[PDB]
Each structure stands twice: as structure tokens, then as C-alpha cells.
């Protein structure tokens, strides 16, 4: 049978599935179809968040049923970029953010262009193509900003 | 005890290692509101699960009481909570990773304390589903009120409240880090749930916000329009590796002023022209939290 999985972003995603399949199973299909990891996926039917260990059957989901998909919104921290005078500015970032776009966030917050930004961590100057994760920045941390 | 014990640098719950999801939700839920106080008070019953007591005792005695009398809670205490969390759900990063407040609420309320579901909803005429919070879901006005979102989301899945909730936590319509249905949302100060019941009012007491990776919190500590505070568990940092964070709580009365304006006035206002901390309340809302009215005076 077919069911429909509607994203909050407006895309409707159609899925071949059987009445006794698990919520885990459905998630895996969605991953294969759209590349969203299952641990990020929250499936909802009739206002009810659907639990991993139960079946479609268990929530009375049938032929032509539409499900809602929303993504988990994980967070926890903010890095700090300090100047030498002691002034601090905070940024929201992921480990996978490039140094380029950390600078781009600094251009967006304060006025400064990335060409004029020297970012330092653990005494090392940070190179634009690398990520924060390359430099083992995996939670709230302190970078130094020096001006060029 | 007093407002001024709560406000300042080195106030609130000290964040540590991706903790902002937990810090901010506990701050929303317990810094001024008492809606869930009983959860910290219900005696251990034989139907209760293994860490029930240690967890309850930790929350009341090492987290909430100190937050309320001293205005401050060390990260060590939150870390004790996170370990308990990790023991109940192994290998799910409760001690080190960025998480969703939803994840946190569900483990804590559903698995450990065994809080009766906060919301009982019926996809109308069907039978009831239980949950701790509601997800706004609907199809794409430019700046909707949370009142509208709730109504629209209810109609979209033909839903009703089976009974009047005491604590209604509503998740804003977002799809991951990178997508917001709406650029700004007006968090209604009061919710009227009359036409959404099967068989009336609720008051906004907090908004949990996040731009992309860090949770912060806005809290209403009185009925006055201006009685808003903002909390960042990681406002500042001291040191490097063994460095520690400094949480901050700040008065943000501007919030009250922007919420006297209409959605269309706020819509015409460029987010860069919105003062103080109000930008984040209007643009980064993640959860709006409503309670049975205690602060207000009916008139």
C-alpha cells in the first residue's frame, strides 16, 4: 500500500509500505528517498508523535494515509570569538562549519570582511577551507580574532 | 527571595558541553512558573521506575531550589542529571551532544518521573492520544500569532483538546536548522482554547528560542507587559580548556513593547531594527509555553 509523508517544507513524499511495518522501517525509507538521518526524523499522525518500536497497524495508519515529518532541532552551544582587549562575541555554529563561513558569520554580525579576519585557535591560524571539527572544536570554545 | 536575585551575570543555570537544550528548558519551566512544581513533589510510588527518587531529589534540591533562592545553578548539577539521563537511555549522547528539548522532556517526563501526559487530544471523534507538547504543522499571512498557528494546525488534523491542559508547550513550525516556515512569529500573550475544546484562557510564561545551534530562553515573571527576562546559559566564558561558562539573566522589557505592536507592524520592521533581545524572541522561537493563568488579574 501507499502512504504520504508531508514535510513542513511543503514536499510530499510517497512511500510503498505494508500495514505491519515499524516506524523505524518507514524512517529508513525516507532516508533512502531524501537523505535525512532517522535520528533526526519525527513522524506524526493525527497530532501523535510515532514511536520507533510500534507498527503502522498500532496507530491505525492505512491506505492513502498522510504522515507529517518534522526534523529534530538539535542545539547546545555557542562559540566565543575574543579580541585582545577582552571583548567577546558569540556565534552559533556547527563542527562542520567551514572557517570561511565562520568568518562570513562575523561579517554578518559585526561589519568585518573575511579578507581582514585572522582567526586563531590553540595558537594556530585557521585556514578557510577547513572546518571547526578539523581543529577539534566540538562544543563551546574560544577563538581569537586579530585584525588585518 | 526576589526578582533581583535572579538577574545578572553569573545567574541562571551554568551551561557546559552542549547543555543549552537542557539548561534553557529547565529555566523556562522552573525559574518563575510553578505549573509543573508537583512533578518535583509527587512521592515515589511502587509503579515508579529505578531513578525516580534520585532524579526528583536532584531536580528539587540541587537545581530548582537553588535557582529560585540563589539565582544560580552550577553545571556540575546538570551534569549529574545528564548522567542519570544517559543511564536511562544509553548511547544517545545525553552527556555530550547537542539534543532537542523534546528528547529531553520525553526521557525525563515519560521514562523517569512518570508525569501524566500534559495534553490529551482527539483527532475529533476518534480516541485520545497522549503527549507532553504539541507540534504545529500546517501549509504555508507573513507573521502569524501562535494563536493562529494552533488553530490552523488543529484544523489541519481535525483535532480537539480532550480536556483543558494546565501546561501547553507548542513547537513552532520549523524543519531542521535551515528552515523556518515563518521568519517572525507573534507569541500570543494569551491563548483562547475555547473553540478547540471538546467540552477557556492560558497565559504565555516562556519562549524557548534557537537560531541554529544554541538554545536560550525568554521568561515572563509577572503580568506586567514589561516583565520579561532573557537567559543564556553561555553568555560568557572564562579560561580555555578547563574554562567554564558564565550564564546570564537580563531584563528585556522591550519584548513587552514589541508585543503591543501588531503582526503587520512587526512584519514591516526589519529584524536588524528590532532592539535588545526582542529580535530573538520574534525570529527564533522554538517552543512557546502556556499555563493556567496565575499571574494575571481578570478584568
Curated annotation (Swiss-Prot), chain A:
There is a cross-link at residues 6, 11, 27, 29, 33, 48, 63 (Glycyl lysine isopeptide (Lys-Gly) (interchain with G-Cter in ubiquitin)). There is a cross-link at residue 76 (Glycyl lysine isopeptide (Gly-Lys) (interchain with K-? in acceptor proteins)). The record marks 54, 72 as: Interacts with activating enzyme. Changing residue 42 to E: Impairs ubiquitination by CRL2(KLHDC3) E3 ligase complex. Impairs ubiquitination by CRL2(KLHDC3) E3 ligase complex. It comes from the Eukaryota. The record marks 68 as: Essential for function. Changing residue 66 to A: Abolishes CteC-catalyzed ADP-ribosylation. The modification ADP-ribosylglycine is found at residue 76. The modification (Microbial infection) ADP-ribosylthreonine is found at residue 66. Changing residue 72 to G: No effect on ADP-ribosylation. The modification Phosphoserine is found at residue 65. Ubiquitin is encoded by 4 different genes. UBA52 and RPS27A genes code for a single copy of ubiquitin fused to the ribosomal proteins eL40 and eS31, respectively. UBB and UBC genes code for a polyubiquitin precursor with exact head to tail repeats, the number of repeats differ between species and strains. For the sake of clarity sequence features are annotated only for the first chain, and are not repeated for each of the following chains. This is Polyubiquitin-C. The gene is UBC.
